[PDB]
Design an enzyme around this catalytic site. Structure first.
Site, PDB file in Angstrom:
ATOM      1  N   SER A 293       0.838  -1.194   0.000  1.00 25.48           N
ATOM      2  CA  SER A 293       0.000   0.000   0.000  1.00 25.48           C
ATOM      3  C   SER A 293       0.878   1.251   0.000  1.00 25.48           C
ATOM      4  O   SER A 293       1.772   1.386  -0.816  1.00 25.48           O
ATOM      5  CB  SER A 293      -0.962  -0.069   1.193  1.00 25.48           C
ATOM      6  OG  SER A 293      -2.029   0.841   1.025  1.00 25.48           O
TER       7      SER A 293
ATOM      8  N   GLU B  15      -1.786  -2.256  -8.221  1.00 22.22           N
ATOM      9  CA  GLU B  15      -2.934  -2.589  -7.400  1.00 22.22           C
ATOM     10  C   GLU B  15      -3.454  -1.336  -6.724  1.00 22.22           C
ATOM     11  O   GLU B  15      -2.717  -0.363  -6.534  1.00 22.22           O
ATOM     12  CB  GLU B  15      -2.600  -3.680  -6.388  1.00 22.22           C
ATOM     13  CG  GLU B  15      -1.600  -3.304  -5.358  1.00 22.22           C
ATOM     14  CD  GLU B  15      -2.223  -2.625  -4.161  1.00 22.22           C
ATOM     15  OE1 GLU B  15      -1.515  -1.916  -3.444  1.00 22.22           O
ATOM     16  OE2 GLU B  15      -3.432  -2.765  -3.905  1.00 22.22           O
TER      17      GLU B  15
ATOM     18  N   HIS C 233      -3.728  -6.020  -0.983  1.00 23.79           N
ATOM     19  CA  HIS C 233      -4.675  -5.901   0.120  1.00 23.79           C
ATOM     20  C   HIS C 233      -5.605  -7.095   0.132  1.00 23.79           C
ATOM     21  O   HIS C 233      -6.799  -6.964  -0.076  1.00 23.79           O
ATOM     22  CB  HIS C 233      -5.537  -4.663  -0.020  1.00 23.79           C
ATOM     23  CG  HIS C 233      -4.775  -3.380  -0.040  1.00 23.79           C
ATOM     24  ND1 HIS C 233      -4.827  -2.474   0.998  1.00 23.79           N
ATOM     25  CD2 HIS C 233      -3.973  -2.831  -0.984  1.00 23.79           C
ATOM     26  CE1 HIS C 233      -4.088  -1.421   0.698  1.00 23.79           C
ATOM     27  NE2 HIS C 233      -3.565  -1.610  -0.505  1.00 23.79           N
TER      28      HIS C 233
END
Lengths: 304, 333
Positions: free
Chosen positions: A110, A206, A274
């Site tokens: 992330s 992502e 995630h």
């Protein structure tokens, strides 16, 4: 290359953005206990348990926290407690020379993308998409198994990266894998901390917890930057908690619109980052992807 | 630097929806906004996606590009104004007829997500574009200080101006907020001030717009290269401290603060400070780490009302100390 993780090694933890060790203390204790039970030492960074609202501390305090771990020769692996939004603030202040002089395993996901890509851009050392302490270790056994498979165990090459992936556009591609969290990449693009995308690269992107409007903007960002004129293939992660705005269209479908029928092999719903459990994978190394058969192999060594 | 013709009374303003489908989702506000300008004697040419719906957007990328290009190519249209922004204007950029625009320069105006197009067109053609009103948010029925926004719009686009041209600080401004029980917004009106965060003066080409939107075009051919001496104009709205710290650090690590001579920061409508009691400019100051760039904050060219209409790509003198902004060269003919 960084040294392989070994049993009994010391994992340093730091909070480059959200103050999760203060706001989720019980999950934090659970995650430490998990790794301690496995025999690892945990070196808690100087901002552990501190709170500055949306962040753990000032930009300078956070850079100091991470630099102490980088400079410590007894730390073999540096893992974020969690991401957030503000890791990119640290980039001008990190001790890249100390890292390059004694490479270690840098891992997270992330928002940690900013640091993973920045260290790789500045030093050439592969870094790792993989667990953060509190979300990942706070199911956990599968995440840990993969962590060890990539970082600790010896692996014959090619190393098959395993995990319901989608063959969106058939084909195969071989090249250096580059990317991470796309929203976070838009906070470092153009800087010395973003590795230059080159012809033949395999793009890994992502996002999570976003909406269709946000991801269209991000995909078009890549398109207008010419990224799709360079890359040989695309690996798109799952998008947990996606808000499709009523469209019924999945993220890959939005990407297909942006691509306007350009034939690029595209494998979607890849299991990073995630997700639970998650894959631990190096960035900045040669990979072969097969979108048709839904496989990804790492082709060169990523640790010693 | 080729220039668009000045707006004239009775001109045709073309409207387009490059992102959110406001003309479908809020038909009444749309009609009231349209009526406001019709009553001023302008003709409003409704783009092809007026009244259309595609969820978070007005139509496909190709449909939206076609909508805008029809306006660019129409020789009867003097001014092209977005109905509203959103998030998705950057999708259009590969498909816009920059050649047709270059050879028939016209006024391109809007704000927020429209930044992608304003900067893209300037990047590709060198023609100044305008940060200023969008139809529905700026001239819709219950927006405040509308006549002041309209006066600023004419001042920049229609009236001849002596140079240097002073961009006058509005006396009063408003934000808006809505509670969970009521169905219409409350507006808080207040005396205005611009803020001399870091004293000094700077003269250079003004470049910028909505910072969040800039991160969707950075590095591409559609982002004008920031040059030594430029004055950076940035605004954001409805964000939180974490988001704006990321955006400010994005500029820092890109070396932007090693290049620019000064910074003009817009008001931040309904900023969420995350409990810190810190203002956006204070977060910027932390990122700058005592690099002391002249910095004028709470400028009225943003999401708050009224809105100034500001040319992008022209020389400006900012005096942060005395809280003035002057445009130094012509931006229309």
């Amino acid at each position: 290359l960084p040294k392989s993780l070994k049993y009994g090694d010391t994992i340093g933890i730091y909070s480059p953005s959200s103050p999760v060790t203060y706001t989720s203390p019980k999950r934090f204790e659970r995650a430490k206990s998990y790794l301690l039970q496995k025999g690892f030492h945990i070196l808690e960074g100087s901002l552990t348990g501190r709170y500055d609202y949306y962040r753990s501390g000032s930009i300078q305090e956070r850079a100091k926290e991470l630099n102490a771990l980088i400079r410590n020769p007894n730390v073999s692996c540096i893992m974020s407690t969690i991401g957030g939004m503000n890791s990119n603030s640290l980039l001008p202040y990190i001790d890249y020379d100390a890292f390059q002089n004694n490479p270690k395993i840098m891992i997270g996901y992330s928002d940690a993308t900013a640091l993973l890509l920045g260290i790789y851009a500045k030093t050439g050392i592969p870094t790792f998409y993989g667990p953060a302490l509190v979300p990942s270790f706070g199911f956990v056994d599968d995440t840990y198994k993969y962590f060890l498979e990539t970082l600790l165990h010896d692996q014959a090459l090619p190393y098959n990266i395993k995990q319901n992936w989608i063959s969106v556009t058939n084909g195969q591609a071989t090249g250096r894998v580059i990317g991470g969290n796309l929203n976070t990449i838009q906070g470092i693009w153009g800087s010395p901390y973003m590795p230059c995308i080159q012809e033949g690269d395999i793009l890994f992107i992502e996002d999570s917890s976003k909406d269709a409007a946000t991801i269209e903007r991000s995909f078009s960002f890549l398109k207008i930057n010419g990224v799709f004129d360079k890359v040989s293939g695309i690996i798109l992660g799952k998008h947990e908690q996606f808000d499709d705005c009523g469209t019924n269209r999945k993220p890959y479908e939005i990407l297909l619109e942006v691509l306007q029928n350009q034939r690029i092999p595209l494998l979607a719903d890849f299991d990073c980052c995630h997700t639970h459990p998650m894959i631990t994978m190096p960035i900045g190394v040669q990979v072969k992807m097969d979108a048709t058969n839904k496989t990804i192999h790492i082709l060169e060594k990523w640790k010693i």
